[PDB]
Nucleic acid binder design. Structure first.
Lengths: 174, 195, 47, 49
DNA sequence: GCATCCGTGAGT
DNA sequence: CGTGTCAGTAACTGTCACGGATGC
């Protein structure tokens, strides 16, 4: 009936009162972290609820099964996922903060590229800014501009060398 | 509950306080506090004034106090809690990541417990730990003993990024490091003019 | 993005505003993969 | 499961305790699963029985 | 009604 | 995966002034 289902929860509560606080200190000595010991205790008692063979015989010690399960839980937690990550904390001192270099070289190169782009015909300038700035394919630019495929190919081929001519005349390093 | 369960409803944890906030008349309690204020009983009148200070704020703003109970917790973008790689091959992540991870672990375990129909003792003892995990994520160390990391070091919470000299304000807003700046040892210069 | 805006407003963030902000739920507790450096799906660093 | 913001519970003065007229220690017993709290009670049905 | 205790702060 | 004799943190107070909500 309805009381048979409440008897099971009343059974779990007793093993709580008698074993959970004692298993917590064991897991705490094995790990050293209390917030992790609480997780260990909860998972162990969950597996206890899932195994009626351990809750069946009262004439057989049940605390030892809990200790062994907690030990095999902590030894598992002590493997690969903990192995790599657990080492460092950024908030903790002794860890270098991530730095990013300045954009000086990139800014100067961008200025020179824009200058060399100004001295190109509208067609060449509108072609190189659709292949490198927009990253489109060779046929996409041809479809957009309403021109042929080899037309885009030749326009890129010449505009690249025109930029090279304008840069070498200003002493841009190879 | 076994006897007169048909007559009352009770609850535990934070969901109970959520229901209590839902079953709460804002205007009625505000005017009930003003009633106590209208009668000069200083000893028991100051303690009512201070309550009105809180209740009228939820009354006028049109904003429900239900926000004090959370159903979903926001996660700060990863670049503000970055995980860097070390020259020894291993890694190092911010404490906020460990706090979020503990929250996630306990929440997923609670989902499992709800699905399995686990005993109410386990489910309540799990919800308690979820509460403590959210409390550690927001302000670790405020209640009880803080969540210790490796080496008995208290983990830095989200509120720790704003506190004191090391917090965001006095460290990155009041004072900033600037470019076009240098530093060197000073030396007397009698030859130089005042300007 | 000009720098003249009068008021800065603060208030309680509703649990619905949290979902309005979020671009997805962080389901799994994993972070990244410790070989490919690629973050695991639905983790704390999910792309 | 719903959770409470620690800034409004443990932070002095307790904002939740001021809203619901509940004591701080009573709130501490409620939230962390140490004592049940009555959310509602059918008083008329109790009178009729 | 009052003693207690908690939480706040403490150079760049 | 199964797990069943038993099995107990580390660390630590060698800060303090001050105010006000907390509690007998």
């Amino acid at each position: 009936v309805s009381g048979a289902a409440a008897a099971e929860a009343a059974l779990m509560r007793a093993l709580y009162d008698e074993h959970a606080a004692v298993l917590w200190r064991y897991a705490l000595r094995l790990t050293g972290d209390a917030a992790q010991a609480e997780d260990v205790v909860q998972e162990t008692l969950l597996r206890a609820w899932q195994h009626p063979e351990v809750i069946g015989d009262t004439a057989r010690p049940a605390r030892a099964w809990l200790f062994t399960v907690a030990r095999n839980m902590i030894i598992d937690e002590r493997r690969s996922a903990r192995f790599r990550n657990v080492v460092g904390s950024t908030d903790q001192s002794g860890t270098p903060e991530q730095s990013t270099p300045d954009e000086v070289n990139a800014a100067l190169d961008r200025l020179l590229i824009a200058d060399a782009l100004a001295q190109l015909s509208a067609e060449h300038r509108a072609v190189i800014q659709r292949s490198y700035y927009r990253g489109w394919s060779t046929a996409q630019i041809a479809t957009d501009l309403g021109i042929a495929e080899g037309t885009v190919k030749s326009r890129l081929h010449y505009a690249v060398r025109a930029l090279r001519l304008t840069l070498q005349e200003l002493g841009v390093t190879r | 509950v076994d006897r007169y369960g048909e007559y009352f409803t009770g609850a535990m944890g934070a969901e109970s306080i959520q229901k209590l906030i839902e079953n709460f008349d804002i205007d009625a309690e505000a005017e009930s506090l003003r009633d106590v204020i209208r009668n000069g009983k200083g000893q028991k009148k100051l303690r009512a004034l201070k309550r009105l200070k809180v209740v009228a704020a939820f009354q006028q703003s049109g904003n429900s106090p239900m926000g004090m109970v959370l159903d979903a917790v926001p996660v700060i973008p990863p670049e503000l809690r970055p995980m860097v790689q070390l020259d020894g091959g291993r890694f190092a992540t911010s404490d906020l990541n460990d706090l979020y991870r503990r929250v996630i672990n306990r929440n997923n375990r609670l989902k499992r417990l709800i699905d399995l129909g686990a005993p109410e003792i386990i489910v309540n003892n799990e919800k308690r730990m979820l509460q403590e995990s959210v409390d550690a994520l927001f302000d670790n160390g405020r209640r009880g003993r803080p969540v210790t990391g490796p080496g008995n070091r208290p983990l830095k919470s989200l509120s720790d990024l704003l506190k004191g000299k090391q917090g965001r304000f006095r460290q990155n807003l009041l004072g900033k490091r600037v470019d076009y700046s240098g530093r060197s040892v000073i030396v007397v210069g009698p030859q130089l003019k005042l300007h | 993005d000009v720098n003249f805006f009068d008021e800065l407003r603060i208030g309680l963030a509703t649990a619905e505003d949290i979902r309005q902000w979020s671009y997805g739920e962080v389901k799994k507790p994993e972070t990244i993969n410790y070989r490919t450096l690629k973050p695991e799906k639905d983790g704390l660093f999910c792309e | 499961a719903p959770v409470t913001h620690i800034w409004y519970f443990k932070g002095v003065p307790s904002r939740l305790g001021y809203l619901l007229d509940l004591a701080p220690k009573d709130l501490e017993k409620i939230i962390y699963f140490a004592a049940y709290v009555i959310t509602s009670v059918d008083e008329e049905m109790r009178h009729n029985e």
